[PDB]
Design a protein around this ligand. Structure first.
Ligand SMILES: CC(C)CN(C[C@@H](O)[C@H](Cc1ccccc1)NC(=O)O[C@H]1CO[C@H]2OCC[C@H]21)S(=O)(=O)c1ccc(N)cc1
Ligand SMILES: [Cl-]
Ligand SMILES: [Cl-]
Ligand code: NA
Lengths: 99, 99
């Protein structure tokens, strides 16, 4: 699809068996999801943005279905205000910015 | 152009006659620029990001070139880690997300 940007580019994702709404975010290096359980090992990390840093749990090799497209990569979990699909997974679904 | 997302989508902007680097950010509602001087009056605004909120100075109808494309709109100034071009100006330059 071609998504215009008059409004937030929100899509449905499936992660860890759960459907969630997430923002397609070219400004995010990493994919950041609100608190949930995910399987496997994790390690703590800090990520920073406007307003400062939050502590997250980093899970590797997580599969997410993004608007019907599967992708695998690292997902960090923590007290983000919005679920964010960052560049590490946007690349995997072939997303580009065009103008 | 068509911008892939393997690297941060950084572009050159021109604002007040000065060139700056900025991130094309579909996850940003608003365009947020590091401290600089802009003409006219400003209004207060709070923006909420990943680590909480910040106060910014909102300037309207600012002339800004983005990757060679002319925009005139709202720019807010404050302590952002990087200059971000948000959807308010991405729409003016005709940007879409495509996959
Ligand atoms: C500021 C950017 C360099 C990075 N951010 C992604 C960005 O798109 C966030 C993504 C975002 C979106 C909503 C809430 C929090 C974070 N947007 C944002 O802060 O936008 C602010 C300016 O416009 C306003 O509209 C949206 C919030 C305001 S970030 O959320 O801080 C971020 C930082 C590091 C990682 N790894 C992943 C995400
Ligand atoms: Cl990854
Ligand atoms: Cl590619
Ligand atoms: Na893992």
């Amino acid at each position: 699809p071609q998504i215009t940007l008059w409004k937030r580019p929100l899509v449905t994702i499936k992660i860890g068996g759960q459907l969630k709404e997430a923002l397609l975010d070219t400004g995010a290096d990493d994919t950041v999801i609100e608190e949930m359980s995910l399987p496997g090992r994790w390690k703590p990390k800090m990520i920073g943005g406007i307003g400062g840093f939050i502590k997250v749990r980093q899970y590797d090799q997580i599969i997410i279905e993004i608007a019907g497209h599967k992708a695998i990569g690292t997902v960090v979990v923590g007290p983000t205000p919005v679920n964010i699909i960052g560049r590490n997974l946007l690349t995997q679904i072939g997303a580009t910015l065009n103008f």
